[PDB]
């Protein structure tokens, strides 16, 4: 490529010798230096980048020759016949570059000679037939003629000829001779360097793009003229290129430089021209740039918005499909992304209308149902494209109830991979979860279980059933139960692991419901039987824990059921609590091996039962004995002593169990533990004493000898000051 | 002793108009009075006598307008086709610078003063003072043109040429009889391109046919090699041609002057491929000088 | 700054902690966390983890996992603090029994509850806390339940208390002070 280095070398030498004669007012022989100079463009041995750098080097050095020829003519020192004087040389290239030099000045200095010379220089461009020299001189021409084209906002030196019509036909002819030669870029030179030709096509294409930027600068090109001449004239140059990359760089250049409103009404025409494109075209990026800039104008304020005539929805859909219909050998991700944009636009441009996005995703199922594709796994990129597709509808809708209220939302989820299907299902549920969803209608009640039907066949469900009590809290004095009963049935069909997390809240949701009819006790007259249904419905749900082999959870649940029965006042509640009392009694006595849990049961049973002041002593006493029976079934001593002591409150005879409590404490080995239990009998006597009396005095004396006969540790002194402080409250002085 | 008498020819209208000039042998640049057919010549032969005390005896004094062509650099066939003679003095003496008035009424000039290699057409006034042994022959060259106005018809030479299954082009010369300051405007119209063409060049080439009949010495030179094109074109390309022939200094196409030499000009469409062959096509054009005229307006 | 709450029932009786309580509680300001119980799900326990790290939990009547301790004690700086729920109490709410509970453990400070109604008093030179339900979780004995949570500042032999209760739709606060004897 050293040919290039010696090329610009001879360039400066004649560059500075022409300026030598320029300063000497030797115009004729200075152009002679330029004539021996521009004949370096005669070569074709240089790389297009190599030639491009020299061409820019030449474009700025003839610019110095231009500013010389400019100040000559501008102030009146115009050497005549230059339009013809330059036409004596042999080599074609120096002769022409001087011709444009004279030509542009003749346009500015002589307004009347505008249109005519414009119709000569551009045709004189074909005075060459090379692909490469053809490009650069005309991009050079575009630089020289950049702003001298006419317009409507024109200075009124009315000798001028030519208007915006002249400009548009001018540059379209420039657009013609550039696109044609840029395709002749593809098949020139040697055969082994087709990639070299195409990469340099990616380089000098910006030169042609400058012509298209010239188009945007024309303010006189309005919507009417553009669509009828400039667009079609471009589209004529669009359809005749018969080359992929030539078509690729151009089309995106048309959208990116031409403003939005020009592309507003070209939807039918331009995309029919897109249907005219080759199969090697990146039609995606063309429509990507389309909807990019189109949605950019749809969401820019300070204007009418989008005209009411234009229904982008159906027009896009009809022309989009034709783009699919016209194309041939097409990867899956192509149609997915276009449908993504269809979803994208139909939501953004039509937020308040929901049946529109419905149809597009309805077509999406119809597209891929007709598409003979098997069950979509995660491997191919189609998985990530349809994921991006399905992601948009849920994210975009502000109130996610509209996501749930979609009937055709369900078909989409079927075709996904198990890993993908699980991941998206918990996400869409989480969206119903992470945002506070209020009362949910029966229609969406069936939806959520249907969404559950997609997921199950984790604690995520527990979060769902956690707000289920809220999003399916209803102010109806009947229906709420059916909501819970639907949860009872369908969530019970989920399996066995889940119900341990949801029934204990669903049953209390029934308690809420049960106490909701405590509120409705005066409002309703059937609530007593409805509770009986609910307390039995609890028993049904509790029985679901039984088949789930759960033991302790129903215990307290029966206890509130006993509490709920005894507090509401519905008919037969005493036996219902009794029935539950027998249930909790039986479950405790059946299987549990450990002791502490059994301790918690009876202590919570006895605590509620004392508070359960609706069991008459015809029922209280048999249960009082059964609580005494339950305590006796234990293994270790001090635990039983606490239980029987608590049984004394059930007679509120009291001191009967107190005497037994003393007896149970007398067969322990370690003196450390037995002595505070002695105190725990004293204070127990103290409490009932203040509600029988002399037993307190003797027992205080009894612990006095029982205290000091031991070896001590950090626990001994704690009970000594405990005892002394115990005396301080008995010190009621 | 120097010359006995110097012959000096000054025309009575040797100051008018302007000068047009022509290039002579060795590239020398000689200027002689431009005339035209039907124009009279008149002047004074200043016979400046140089040697005082001596005398110039003679057998007459005359001046001859001799329009003659010399062919093949030979003096044995110097042929005068124009010969007008004015007698200035009879046999006598020259003792001083005597001015003799001469005037050849309406000198007929059937051909333009043109100079070739083996062709040399000249007009001159030869003063021949007949001395006893050596007549003082003084020559005063005079350039003359061949005038003609615009032609009635200058038809469009529109022809198809090419090489079979290799090339076929339509070249259109808008005119066929141009004058010396014309412009060749036309078009080259491709109909077939299957060759790795490197360029197209148009050569303005003269054939100087010299001699009479079989003695044909046609020297051929390319004054111009005009460039219009480069590279190998494709189907559907139109090539206007624009060539100013002013920078060529051409001579009118002279059709068999005196049946001893002719001047014809041919355009040669020369086409060269990357393998360096040349394809040529020959087309005659007539040239002719037109007028020294006030340049403006056009019919 | 230490926090006190209890009787949550996050899945059980309500949906979650009331929104205004969950903007007041933000991570960074509180250095220790204390709870009474009835989490009923790792949600509140993990939410307490988000709030701070010095978190200590005792089992309610309705929590499930067995790794949580039934009771816990702490001697932070100067004070002795006890931690229970409150279901292990005769006719829950008895004044004499709770005075006994400190008398057993000889702490300076107790936390209790299980009644879902807020209580707090100082007695026999010792001081007790019943934050109640911080989610307004229903209780059988008392119909209406008000969410309420407690925060406390201990400098030296002196703890400030701040309890926020849910009456109506606003945060109403009552302030109580304690001095270590």
Numbering used by the authors:
A (entry chain D1): 13 to 469, 484 to 678, 695 to 733, 739 to 780
B (entry chain B3): 8 to 306
C (entry chain B4): 2 to 182
Quote the passages of the study that discuss this structure, keeping the authors' original sentences.
Retromer (VPS26/VPS35/VPS29 subunits) is one important complex that plays a well-established role in protein sorting at endosomes by maintaining dynamic localization of hundreds of transmembrane proteins that traverse the endocytic system. Briefly, VPS35 adopts an elongated α-helical solenoid fold. VPS26 exists as three orthologs in mammals (VPS26A/VPS26B/VPS26C) and adopts a bilobal arrestin-like fold. VPS29 contains a metallophosphoesterase fold that serves as a scaffold for binding the α-helical solenoid of the VPS35 C terminus.
To generate improved reconstructions, we combined images from previously published data with a new third dataset in which specimens were tilted to gain additional views. We obtained an improved heterotrimer reconstruction from 43,808 particles with an average resolution of 4.9 Å. Map sharpening in PHENIX followed by several rounds of refinement and model building (see the Experimental procedures section) further improved the heterotrimer model. This structure demonstrates improved local resolution across the heterotrimer. In the previous version, the N-VPS35/C-VPS26 interface was poorly resolved compared with the VPS35–VPS29 interface. In the new structure, the arrestin “saddle” fold of VPS26 is more clearly resolved. For comparison, the buried surface interface between N-VPS35 and C-VPS26 in the heterotrimer structure is 6178 Å2. We previously proposed that the VPS35 subunit could exhibit flexibility along the length of its α-helical solenoid, as judged by local resolution along the heterotrimer particle. However, the new reconstruction instead suggests that the poor local resolution at the N terminus was instead driven by missing views.
